[PDB]
Amino acid sequence: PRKAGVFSDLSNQELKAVHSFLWSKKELRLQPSSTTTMAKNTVFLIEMLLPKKYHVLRFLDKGERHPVREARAVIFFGDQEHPNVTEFAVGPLPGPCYMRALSPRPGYQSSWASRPISTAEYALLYHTLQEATKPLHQFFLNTTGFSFQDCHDRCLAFTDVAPRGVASGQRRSWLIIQRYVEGYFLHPTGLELLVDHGSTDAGHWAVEQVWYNGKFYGSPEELARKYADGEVDVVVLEEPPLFSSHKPRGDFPSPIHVSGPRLVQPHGPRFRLEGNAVLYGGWSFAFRLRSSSGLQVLNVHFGGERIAYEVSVQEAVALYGGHTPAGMQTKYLDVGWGLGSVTHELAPGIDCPETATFLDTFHYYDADDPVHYPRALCLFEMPTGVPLRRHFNSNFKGGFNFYAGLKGQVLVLRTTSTVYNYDYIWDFIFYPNGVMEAKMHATGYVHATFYTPEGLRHGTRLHTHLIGNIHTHLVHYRVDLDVAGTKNSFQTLQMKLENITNPWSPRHRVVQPTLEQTQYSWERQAAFRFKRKLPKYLLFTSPQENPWGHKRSYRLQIHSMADQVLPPGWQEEQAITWARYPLAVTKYRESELCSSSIYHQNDPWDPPVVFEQFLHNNENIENEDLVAWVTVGFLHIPHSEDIPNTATPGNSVGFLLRPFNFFPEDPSLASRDTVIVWPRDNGPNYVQRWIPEDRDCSMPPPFSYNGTYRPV
Amino acid sequence: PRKAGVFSDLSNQELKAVHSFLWSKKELRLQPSSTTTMAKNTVFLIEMLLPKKYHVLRFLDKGERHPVREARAVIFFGDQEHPNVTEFAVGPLPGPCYMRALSPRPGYQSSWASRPISTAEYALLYHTLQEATKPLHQFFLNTTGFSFQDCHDRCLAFTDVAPRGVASGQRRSWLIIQRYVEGYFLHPTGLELLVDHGSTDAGHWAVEQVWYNGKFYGSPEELARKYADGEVDVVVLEEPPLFSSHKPRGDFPSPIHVSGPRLVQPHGPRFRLEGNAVLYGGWSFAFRLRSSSGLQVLNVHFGGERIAYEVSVQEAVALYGGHTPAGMQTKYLDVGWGLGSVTHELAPGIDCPETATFLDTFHYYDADDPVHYPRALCLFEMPTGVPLRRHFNSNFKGGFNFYAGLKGQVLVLRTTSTVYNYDYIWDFIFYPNGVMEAKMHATGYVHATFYTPEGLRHGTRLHTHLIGNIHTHLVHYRVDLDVAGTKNSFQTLQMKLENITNPWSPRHRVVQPTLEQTQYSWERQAAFRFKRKLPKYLLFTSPQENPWGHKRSYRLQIHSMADQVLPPGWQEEQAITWARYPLAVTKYRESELCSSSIYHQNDPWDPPVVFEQFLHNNENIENEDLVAWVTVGFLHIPHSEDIPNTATPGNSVGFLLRPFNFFPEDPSLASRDTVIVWPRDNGPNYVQRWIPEDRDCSMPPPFSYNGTYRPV
Ligand SMILES: *[C@@H]1O[C@H](CO)[C@@H](O[C@@H]2O[C@H](CO)[C@@H](O)[C@H](O)[C@H]2NC(C)=O)[C@H](O)[C@H]1NC(C)=O
Ligand SMILES: *[C@@H]1O[C@H](CO)[C@@H](O[C@@H]2O[C@H](CO)[C@@H](O)[C@H](O)[C@H]2NC(C)=O)[C@H](O)[C@H]1NC(C)=O
Ligand SMILES: *[C@@H]1O[C@H](CO)[C@@H](O[C@@H]2O[C@H](CO)[C@@H](O)[C@H](O)[C@H]2NC(C)=O)[C@H](O)[C@H]1NC(C)=O
Ligand SMILES: *[C@@H]1O[C@H](CO)[C@@H](O[C@@H]2O[C@H](CO)[C@@H](O)[C@H](O)[C@H]2NC(C)=O)[C@H](O)[C@H]1NC(C)=O
Ligand SMILES: *[C@@H]1O[C@H](CO)[C@@H](O)[C@H](O)[C@H]1NC(C)=O
Ligand SMILES: *[C@@H]1O[C@H](CO)[C@@H](O)[C@H](O)[C@H]1NC(C)=O
Ligand SMILES: [Ca+2]
Ligand SMILES: [Ca+2]
Ligand SMILES: [Ca+2]
Ligand SMILES: [Ca+2]
Ligand SMILES: [Cu+2]
Ligand SMILES: [Cu+2]
């Protein structure tokens, strides 16, 4: 509440303040993001710029002054001879006085082409594509029944892929032309266009290449002449619902006419929410939605003792192959698209339980004013349907000495990212026994292309005209564990057999397990590449010992199917060198807070952060502020079941943090939810309890869904 | 209901019938299992002996005669010159006429020593240990305050480990001496005794070796003389609750005085249960608790079409190291202990939801009569707290074209096994979109030994006098997939990069994913050892194609941390050669229905099934009845949090079966649970539905727990 305020995202008022401040500086010549020109200076992003960890810890632990509060302000400088992007620490909040230019990068010339694509830019792009396809109007109507001009009922739409070209400083986008219908992602026409939209005058932008149904055509006029002259082999496209729709069809042979079970919370939340500060049994932690990178949890304690200064989403990637130029061009990095800013409204009873506590926020990303995002996050406790622990202590003669068990519950902090086609559900999950989990579930629409037969060596035919392209999902977390404090060491444990004389039968031998430990002293020792077999136990230790002599530690357990995807060193792989390492441990530093950025998507050849560089000074990691970095992911080969959407079952990855000799015993023993039943020969067994059995009823508030996200 | 009866376990009546039948054969000279002698012929196990798959399929698919119903009857022949164990197909049911001797094994002499340990045998063992420790009475009272004689308030108890000796035909058990208190598993005295209980006359059994607090003593009298003469360095042992108890202690700094959310099912079960036959949306399947091996599902269909003839638990293993003779002796294989027969009563609201449908059964395992097991299984639908699918189709200008989502639900078929210290929760889980999952969660008490400092190279100090021994949990499943029918092939898919000229920029290159496939023609090709990297996509295919040209298939996705544990070929590893293979594919055969047995625990050197042998004829697996075999597991290094119990969070393994081009589109589209919200400028959005929004209340039946398991 009062403490966690340091970790809190910017209020509507705070965002408006920083905006007025920057607008008051007339020399910036700022214009709203909506202006219909690239030739413009604009404030593209504003978010809370976290203070130094040193000062934050002195405020939290040493009772010191509250650290100064600061905005990050990403300004696009389109309106000048040499356009660029610059970032700025605007502070203090409240009462802004300065804007301090952030992280200079000498040598680099391509900041302008590395920019994310804005709303305005898309608008202008829609203008280009309308002009340049003028010659193909007839072609469109004959092949698709749709068009870019007038169009009314049947409009052709497009999906830009990224990155945009073949080298740094390029902004040449492959656009996949589709029919704008329900779930338009699944309706490619077969046309693809390369548009150079590099210039700040949209008048110089041009369609530099055409691809149709397996063939390149140079220009639209050329495809038009060649079609008109019978030289283009074309494909003419087509109650019941669209295959691309979520509307039901088919019948289960055992049909279902009622709602399934739901959660009731008659006694209210058992966690205490206050601002961005949560308490839940042993747990205490803060959170934030960083507009740029996504969801975080900060200052995580269990039982008064710190475990993690920060756990946060760093980058989310989708790397594709293809038969078509667009399909082979696609390496999507979502932080270039505002992964934290596409946190669209959760639907009660669907996305989160009806009983969940829904939380709003504001994002200033490619916006004229701060934008209200309703139910951007939810927080809720749910039954797991599996008991946290249980034991049937039998007496092996017909009866029992006792049954004990603690019904399973968990607190879930959830948000989403829906950039375009895909919907990622982000989870941070807190068990009563000190285990924390991180999960990502993928759902929504797959990224897909027009079917030709050559495209089956890069994916799967999902429908008559639809190829689901092969791709890898990879996600990077930053896991700043501060186990029982700032200073830690990292160690790993393996089982190693020993071959020894049988001590009670000297003729024979005993080959058996033995607990082997490995210390790690330098960063590079703890950079585990995908070929390097990952040790079964990954422990981040405190020097303090538990009551039984063992180092107090937290274990990191990764759930993933990731492998190496791009060849190390090759081109666009420079943007995702974190993807070489399922685990990497660095020594903490203010210069290495993020493994990605908003610029990586459009200049992955020469990005402003290469995670590999973090390891270059190969620093000593004995008793230092350590940071774990985790890559989780999976190879997604589309299948017919992904139509209309990828389903979440089994489509999740993440990791667990588990206490390991951190607590003297099971820290969930504090829970009064436990139930022990004791045997009696005569009458009812003694159902021993510490909370009364409850069977109360309550009723959730009625369903509602706004679906809009505007300023306030 | 009428069909699934072929897969159904034996009724109380059926078990009684087979028993009377075998009792009527006077030449067997049978005695009840309770008789206080090993020198006895007894019926140790009776269970339903599944008919041949050929006949079962002709009954299910070809509309043929119902296959004859048969009991398996494991008889111990203790009362003869050469004791042995023999098994028998007793049938037909109803109206038994014969008992046909099962699976002869020429050459083998050690069937008697391979027997599971019975109640009676434990009784006799308690007699031996009381006699033989007579000299140590004083020692016990001085060190432990407890004893084996009179004892009343303070009785010493024991925990036998397995296997029992150093070669086949031995029955020499290391016993860990403990104080019989609440959670006695965690109270080792420091004494260990090797008892040869090989003879059928308990009068010949003898304590052949003693181990105390780091030293072997030959005999009890010798430890007694040496203690009495000041030569034995000993350790004297010790409101608040026992550390080994489930009773709460400690306080959360944010305390919790109310129950957390619970499931209500006001509209009843949405699945139809009839006998051992279940329907749930697309799903149809049967089940059984095989007393010997555990839970199975049989005849699994989705949408009328078969996917799996059988999915079943085959074996569950716990392989330990130790400082002490017992700790280094312990390789527990639970099927030797009646893994399916220790299915003790589920506690409503704890083990399964209050809203679950609880099912009883009967087991005849080491019993004088069939024994009623209340709530041995449960079946229930629960919300996952994650939507099966969802999408926010934005219009990227402040609003939305629609939100769609299907709230997440799942059907869980659950049982447990609690052999002794450990409690395994077995799950079979059915999602509405055709995904099925198999899960095992471990909880209950760890297997532990007396603390000496040498024991820290085989585990962890959990308490003053308690070492939690290092071990590996490994589980074997039999996964008889019959994907769209009996005949299948197995293939795997990988991503393989290609390096090609950039087709739209010939100066540059494109290094990108490409979908590679691998066919498998022989068994040995599909035996993946732990060093052999497992392909990301493991597909069992039908020849039939979907509407888009792709082979209809089900994908197997393993969730595990298993590695090779014992060296292939070395001794007791002969019992667990399935543990070499995270996946193995065999061609179906009536001689290879199980990868383990009830004999493996006590003769793992020369067991009656070696899974490796299944692969020896290396048969062709192109379009044949294939059987998948899966090993899942994890290295368990005990930690202080495992006290008093191992907690289930993150302590689970298993696998998913997912449709892969099996269905023309998402098979969950049949579900009327889906909700689509449509945008409107004026008033409320159109919340489009196919089941009415529901907010009904109901109340679960009040908590109860019997805790006994007797005949009826
Ligand atoms: C990025 O563009 C900004 C805006 O023009 C440049 O910053 C200005 O630089 C000139 C010096 O040539 C100063 O007179 C202004 O005071 C600066 N203003 C601000 C707000 O920064 C900046 O130099 C450009 N970056 C690069 C690398 O050239
Ligand atoms: C464990 O160690 C022993 C001793 O090195 C090995 O036993 C020897 O094995 C060879 C055959 O490989 C025999 O010729 C020797 O006679 C054996 N000696 C003894 C004393 O047993 C054994 O192979 C090793 N086992 C493992 C799994 O490493
Ligand atoms: C296991 O013990 C059984 C019981 O004695 C043996 O089965 C009997 O064998 C004799 C032949 O020596 C027959 O006369 C009996 O009719 C058999 N009875 C039954 C019920 O099987 C069996 O031979 C023993 N197994 C082995 C391998 O020796
Ligand atoms: C992809 O293939 C090309 C051609 O084999 C490789 O490019 C050559 O790389 C070497 C250096 O390793 C240069 O000397 C040649 O001039 C390059 N030729 C061309 C046409 O580019 C490239 O290294 C390969 N990349 C990968 C990741 O395998
Ligand atoms: C959504 O919220 C906006 C902003 O408060 C409000 O004006 C509008 O009426 C709401 N729309 C719906 C459909 O509830
Ligand atoms: C448990 O069930 C048995 C068998 O029906 C019954 O006799 C007994 O009264 C029940 N015990 C309890 C405590 O409910
Ligand atoms: Ca740290
Ligand atoms: Ca470094
Ligand atoms: Ca099969
Ligand atoms: Ca074979
Ligand atoms: Cu995907
Ligand atoms: Cu374990």
Tab-separated table of N, CA and C in Angstrom, chain A residues 249 258 262-264 270 322 328 349-351 385 388 390-391 394 398 403 414 418 423 457 461 498 512 515 537 550 635 637 640-641 643 648 651 658 661-663 665-666 685 693 695 700 703 705-706 709, chain B residues 249 258 262-264 270 322 328 350-351 385 388 390-391 394 398 403 407 414 418 423 457 461 498 512 515 537 550 635 637 640-641 643 648 651 658 661-663 665-666 685 693 695 700 703 705-706 709:
chain	number	residue	atom	x	y	z
A	249	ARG	N	-20.795	-25.080	-33.928
A	249	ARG	CA	-21.344	-25.942	-34.948
A	249	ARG	C	-20.919	-27.348	-34.596
A	258	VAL	N	-26.477	-27.413	-20.030
A	258	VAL	CA	-26.355	-26.649	-18.804
A	258	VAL	C	-24.941	-26.099	-18.638
A	262	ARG	N	-19.120	-23.748	-11.221
A	262	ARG	CA	-18.430	-22.476	-11.066
A	262	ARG	C	-17.986	-22.237	-9.624
A	263	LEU	N	-17.007	-21.349	-9.479
A	263	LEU	CA	-16.493	-20.941	-8.177
A	263	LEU	C	-17.414	-19.926	-7.528
A	264	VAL	N	-17.686	-20.126	-6.237
A	264	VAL	CA	-18.292	-19.094	-5.405
A	264	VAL	C	-17.304	-18.653	-4.318
A	270	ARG	N	-9.604	-13.702	0.132
A	270	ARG	CA	-8.744	-14.024	1.277
A	270	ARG	C	-7.367	-13.396	1.154
A	322	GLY	N	8.349	-20.077	-44.230
A	322	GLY	CA	7.269	-19.953	-45.211
A	322	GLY	C	7.634	-20.298	-46.641
A	328	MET	N	8.168	-16.528	-44.973
A	328	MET	CA	9.593	-16.656	-44.674
A	328	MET	C	10.190	-15.397	-44.047
A	349	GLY	N	-15.795	-14.791	-15.782
A	349	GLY	CA	-16.323	-16.143	-15.925
A	349	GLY	C	-15.665	-16.906	-17.047
A	350	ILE	N	-14.920	-16.195	-17.905
A	350	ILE	CA	-14.262	-16.799	-19.064
A	350	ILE	C	-12.742	-16.724	-18.913
A	351	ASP	N	-12.207	-15.505	-18.989
A	351	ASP	CA	-10.771	-15.243	-18.897
A	351	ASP	C	-10.246	-15.419	-17.488
A	385	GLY	N	-8.255	-28.145	-7.470
A	385	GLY	CA	-8.764	-29.503	-7.620
A	385	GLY	C	-7.744	-30.565	-7.234
A	388	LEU	N	-3.128	-29.587	-1.636
A	388	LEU	CA	-1.722	-29.158	-1.444
A	388	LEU	C	-0.886	-30.283	-0.833
A	390	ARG	N	-1.732	-34.366	1.266
A	390	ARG	CA	-2.670	-35.279	1.868
A	390	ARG	C	-1.963	-36.575	2.228
A	391	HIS	N	-2.469	-37.254	3.249
A	391	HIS	CA	-1.951	-38.550	3.620
A	391	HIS	C	-3.025	-39.390	4.277
A	394	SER	N	-2.808	-45.373	7.190
A	394	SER	CA	-3.522	-46.615	7.486
A	394	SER	C	-2.961	-47.314	8.714
A	398	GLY	N	-7.636	-52.844	8.382
A	398	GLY	CA	-9.032	-52.515	8.106
A	398	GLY	C	-9.404	-51.072	8.368
A	403	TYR	N	-6.610	-39.501	8.674
A	403	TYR	CA	-6.462	-38.918	7.353
A	403	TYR	C	-6.159	-37.456	7.608
A	414	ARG	N	-3.163	-12.238	-13.205
A	414	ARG	CA	-3.279	-12.501	-14.645
A	414	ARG	C	-3.479	-11.231	-15.441
A	418	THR	N	-2.831	-9.107	-26.531
A	418	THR	CA	-3.410	-9.441	-27.829
A	418	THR	C	-2.931	-8.365	-28.761
A	423	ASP	N	-3.454	-14.314	-28.789
A	423	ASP	CA	-3.789	-13.894	-27.443
A	423	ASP	C	-2.947	-14.675	-26.442
A	457	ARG	N	6.064	-27.599	-47.031
A	457	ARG	CA	7.361	-27.767	-46.375
A	457	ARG	C	7.656	-26.599	-45.415
A	461	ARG	N	-1.830	-27.310	-44.266
A	461	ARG	CA	-3.066	-26.839	-44.866
A	461	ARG	C	-4.200	-26.909	-43.829
A	498	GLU	N	27.546	-44.163	-7.298
A	498	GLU	CA	28.833	-44.615	-6.803
A	498	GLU	C	28.811	-46.121	-6.893
A	512	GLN	N	24.587	-47.115	-6.466
A	512	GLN	CA	23.506	-46.370	-5.859
A	512	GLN	C	23.746	-44.884	-6.044
A	515	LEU	N	24.473	-37.658	-3.697
A	515	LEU	CA	24.089	-36.285	-3.988
A	515	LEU	C	25.332	-35.512	-4.354
A	537	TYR	N	18.507	-29.824	-10.622
A	537	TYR	CA	18.266	-28.911	-9.524
A	537	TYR	C	19.047	-27.639	-9.758
A	550	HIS	N	21.526	-26.756	6.235
A	550	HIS	CA	21.591	-26.592	4.796
A	550	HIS	C	21.346	-25.156	4.395
A	635	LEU	N	7.880	-25.309	-30.177
A	635	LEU	CA	7.700	-25.427	-31.617
A	635	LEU	C	6.217	-25.622	-31.901
A	637	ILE	N	3.739	-26.421	-34.751
A	637	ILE	CA	3.333	-26.804	-36.084
A	637	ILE	C	1.806	-26.745	-36.161
A	640	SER	N	-5.184	-28.761	-37.958
A	640	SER	CA	-6.579	-28.407	-38.236
A	640	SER	C	-7.347	-27.952	-36.972
A	641	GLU	N	-6.971	-28.491	-35.809
A	641	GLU	CA	-7.602	-28.110	-34.550
A	641	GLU	C	-7.352	-26.651	-34.158
A	643	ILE	N	-8.078	-24.228	-35.799
A	643	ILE	CA	-9.096	-23.464	-36.528
A	643	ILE	C	-10.417	-23.521	-35.753
A	648	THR	N	-5.719	-23.390	-25.564
A	648	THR	CA	-4.712	-23.306	-24.500
A	648	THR	C	-4.293	-24.670	-23.909
A	651	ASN	N	-0.795	-25.774	-24.292
A	651	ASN	CA	-0.130	-24.735	-25.084
A	651	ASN	C	0.357	-23.687	-24.100
A	658	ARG	N	10.606	-22.767	-6.210
A	658	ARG	CA	10.228	-23.556	-5.039
A	658	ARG	C	11.213	-23.369	-3.900
A	661	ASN	N	15.200	-25.911	1.290
A	661	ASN	CA	15.830	-25.684	2.610
A	661	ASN	C	15.757	-24.222	3.087
A	662	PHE	N	14.774	-23.496	2.553
A	662	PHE	CA	14.588	-22.085	2.881
A	662	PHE	C	13.836	-21.955	4.205
A	663	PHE	N	12.946	-22.916	4.465
A	663	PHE	CA	12.069	-22.888	5.621
A	663	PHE	C	12.378	-24.091	6.453
A	665	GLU	N	10.420	-26.070	7.930
A	665	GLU	CA	9.480	-27.107	7.553
A	665	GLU	C	8.468	-26.511	6.555
A	666	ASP	N	7.527	-27.330	6.101
A	666	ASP	CA	6.478	-26.885	5.171
A	666	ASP	C	5.844	-25.564	5.598
A	685	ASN	N	-16.314	-40.170	13.502
A	685	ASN	CA	-14.896	-39.833	13.642
A	685	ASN	C	-14.812	-38.359	14.012
A	693	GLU	N	-16.308	-25.894	8.902
A	693	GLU	CA	-16.820	-26.356	7.627
A	693	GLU	C	-17.787	-25.317	7.140
A	695	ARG	N	-20.456	-24.014	3.851
A	695	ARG	CA	-21.274	-24.387	2.710
A	695	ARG	C	-22.116	-23.196	2.256
A	700	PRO	N	-22.411	-14.257	-8.003
A	700	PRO	CA	-21.509	-13.304	-8.621
A	700	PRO	C	-22.270	-12.180	-9.288
A	703	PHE	N	-22.880	-10.858	-15.615
A	703	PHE	CA	-21.903	-10.672	-16.688
A	703	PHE	C	-21.993	-9.281	-17.317
A	705	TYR	N	-19.402	-6.633	-20.201
A	705	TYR	CA	-18.209	-6.517	-21.012
A	705	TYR	C	-18.269	-5.231	-21.812
A	706	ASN	N	-17.348	-4.329	-21.537
A	706	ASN	CA	-17.376	-3.057	-22.224
A	706	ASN	C	-16.803	-3.124	-23.630
A	709	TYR	N	-11.828	1.106	-24.971
A	709	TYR	CA	-10.642	1.518	-24.236
A	709	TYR	C	-10.253	2.937	-24.666
B	249	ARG	N	0.803	-24.885	12.786
B	249	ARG	CA	1.613	-24.098	13.686
B	249	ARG	C	2.217	-22.988	12.859
B	258	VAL	N	-11.150	-17.485	7.021
B	258	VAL	CA	-12.296	-17.955	6.266
B	258	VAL	C	-11.888	-19.028	5.261
B	262	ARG	N	-15.046	-22.144	-3.385
B	262	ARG	CA	-15.345	-23.529	-3.720
B	262	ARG	C	-16.236	-23.639	-4.955
B	263	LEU	N	-16.201	-24.818	-5.568
B	263	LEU	CA	-17.029	-25.137	-6.725
B	263	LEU	C	-18.443	-25.480	-6.298
B	264	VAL	N	-19.421	-24.921	-7.012
B	264	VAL	CA	-20.802	-25.383	-6.928
B	264	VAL	C	-21.234	-25.984	-8.271
B	270	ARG	N	-22.409	-32.809	-15.730
B	270	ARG	CA	-22.613	-32.675	-17.177
B	270	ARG	C	-22.056	-33.860	-17.947
B	322	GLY	N	21.777	-44.289	-0.024
B	322	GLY	CA	21.833	-44.119	1.430
B	322	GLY	C	23.203	-44.273	2.060
B	328	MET	N	20.634	-47.457	1.330
B	328	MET	CA	21.253	-47.917	0.089
B	328	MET	C	20.573	-49.152	-0.500
B	350	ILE	N	-11.352	-31.965	-0.341
B	350	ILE	CA	-9.901	-31.968	-0.154
B	350	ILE	C	-9.214	-32.677	-1.323
B	351	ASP	N	-9.410	-33.994	-1.403
B	351	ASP	CA	-8.810	-34.840	-2.434
B	351	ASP	C	-9.450	-34.631	-3.790
B	385	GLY	N	-9.854	-22.361	-14.540
B	385	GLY	CA	-9.421	-20.982	-14.355
B	385	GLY	C	-8.669	-20.428	-15.558
B	388	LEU	N	-10.579	-22.184	-22.404
B	388	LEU	CA	-10.140	-23.143	-23.447
B	388	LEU	C	-9.621	-22.408	-24.683
B	390	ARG	N	-9.764	-18.041	-26.325
B	390	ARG	CA	-10.299	-16.704	-26.249
B	390	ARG	C	-9.595	-15.814	-27.259
B	391	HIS	N	-10.296	-14.788	-27.724
B	391	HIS	CA	-9.704	-13.811	-28.607
B	391	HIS	C	-10.383	-12.467	-28.455
B	394	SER	N	-9.685	-6.747	-31.790
B	394	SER	CA	-9.733	-5.286	-31.734
B	394	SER	C	-9.992	-4.673	-33.102
B	398	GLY	N	-9.846	2.157	-30.681
B	398	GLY	CA	-10.555	2.433	-29.434
B	398	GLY	C	-11.584	1.393	-29.051
B	403	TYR	N	-15.415	-9.880	-28.878
B	403	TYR	CA	-14.653	-10.725	-27.977
B	403	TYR	C	-15.319	-12.083	-28.065
B	407	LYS	N	-15.102	-20.594	-21.659
B	407	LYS	CA	-14.627	-20.868	-20.291
B	407	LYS	C	-14.073	-22.280	-20.215
B	414	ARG	N	-10.057	-39.673	-11.060
B	414	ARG	CA	-8.978	-39.687	-10.064
B	414	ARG	C	-9.083	-40.869	-9.127
B	418	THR	N	-1.776	-45.278	-1.705
B	418	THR	CA	-1.019	-44.996	-0.489
B	418	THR	C	-0.572	-46.338	0.016
B	423	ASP	N	1.803	-40.921	-0.811
B	423	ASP	CA	0.475	-40.863	-1.390
B	423	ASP	C	0.568	-40.351	-2.822
B	457	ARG	N	25.866	-37.286	1.946
B	457	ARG	CA	26.179	-37.580	0.547
B	457	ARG	C	25.138	-38.534	-0.069
B	461	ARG	N	19.474	-33.469	5.768
B	461	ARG	CA	19.019	-33.455	7.148
B	461	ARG	C	17.695	-32.678	7.245
B	498	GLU	N	16.612	-24.235	-43.426
B	498	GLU	CA	17.161	-24.310	-44.767
B	498	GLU	C	17.881	-23.004	-44.999
B	512	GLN	N	15.719	-20.176	-42.481
B	512	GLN	CA	14.368	-20.222	-41.967
B	512	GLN	C	13.971	-21.663	-41.710
B	515	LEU	N	9.489	-27.811	-42.326
B	515	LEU	CA	8.878	-28.897	-41.576
B	515	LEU	C	9.473	-30.198	-42.056
B	537	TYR	N	7.699	-33.415	-31.824
B	537	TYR	CA	6.380	-33.880	-32.202
B	537	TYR	C	6.407	-35.385	-32.340
B	550	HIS	N	-4.024	-33.983	-44.667
B	550	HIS	CA	-3.037	-34.449	-43.713
B	550	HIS	C	-3.521	-35.675	-42.976
B	635	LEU	N	13.836	-36.641	-10.198
B	635	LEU	CA	14.817	-36.753	-9.127
B	635	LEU	C	14.298	-35.983	-7.921
B	637	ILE	N	15.334	-34.769	-4.405
B	637	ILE	CA	16.232	-34.528	-3.299
B	637	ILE	C	15.430	-33.917	-2.148
B	640	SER	N	13.801	-29.424	3.624
B	640	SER	CA	13.082	-29.171	4.876
B	640	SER	C	11.563	-28.969	4.667
B	641	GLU	N	11.178	-28.428	3.508
B	641	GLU	CA	9.769	-28.222	3.189
B	641	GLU	C	8.979	-29.526	3.047
B	643	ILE	N	8.677	-31.654	5.161
B	643	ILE	CA	8.303	-32.018	6.532
B	643	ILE	C	7.057	-31.224	6.941
B	648	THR	N	2.301	-31.337	-3.220
B	648	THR	CA	2.054	-31.639	-4.635
B	648	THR	C	2.466	-30.514	-5.610
B	651	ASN	N	5.132	-31.182	-8.069
B	651	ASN	CA	5.597	-32.546	-7.798
B	651	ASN	C	4.696	-33.474	-8.591
B	658	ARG	N	-2.874	-35.165	-27.717
B	658	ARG	CA	-3.564	-34.068	-28.395
B	658	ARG	C	-3.921	-34.435	-29.823
B	661	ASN	N	-4.320	-32.925	-36.668
B	661	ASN	CA	-5.018	-33.132	-37.957
B	661	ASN	C	-6.045	-34.278	-37.926
B	662	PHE	N	-6.523	-34.584	-36.719
B	662	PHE	CA	-7.483	-35.666	-36.518
B	662	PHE	C	-8.893	-35.176	-36.846
B	663	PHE	N	-9.136	-33.889	-36.583
B	663	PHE	CA	-10.448	-33.287	-36.729
B	663	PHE	C	-10.339	-32.205	-37.755
B	665	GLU	N	-11.578	-29.307	-37.757
B	665	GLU	CA	-11.361	-28.062	-37.046
B	665	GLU	C	-11.466	-28.337	-35.534
B	666	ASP	N	-11.291	-27.298	-34.726
B	666	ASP	CA	-11.397	-27.411	-33.264
B	666	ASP	C	-12.632	-28.195	-32.828
B	685	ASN	N	-23.837	-4.003	-25.347
B	685	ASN	CA	-23.315	-4.897	-26.382
B	685	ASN	C	-24.187	-6.144	-26.389
B	693	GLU	N	-26.892	-17.402	-19.341
B	693	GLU	CA	-26.058	-17.033	-18.215
B	693	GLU	C	-26.698	-17.611	-16.986
B	695	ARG	N	-26.387	-18.236	-12.610
B	695	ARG	CA	-25.854	-17.781	-11.338
B	695	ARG	C	-26.517	-18.539	-10.190
B	700	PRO	N	-23.339	-28.307	-1.260
B	700	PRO	CA	-22.831	-29.665	-1.293
B	700	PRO	C	-23.268	-30.444	-0.073
B	703	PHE	N	-19.681	-32.622	4.881
B	703	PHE	CA	-18.469	-33.437	4.944
B	703	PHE	C	-18.687	-34.740	5.716
B	705	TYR	N	-16.398	-38.790	6.349
B	705	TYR	CA	-15.223	-39.586	6.068
B	705	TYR	C	-15.257	-40.845	6.912
B	706	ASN	N	-15.352	-41.985	6.255
B	706	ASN	CA	-15.442	-43.223	6.997
B	706	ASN	C	-14.099	-43.706	7.520
B	709	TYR	N	-12.314	-49.879	5.743
B	709	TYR	CA	-12.375	-50.614	4.489
B	709	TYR	C	-12.487	-52.113	4.792
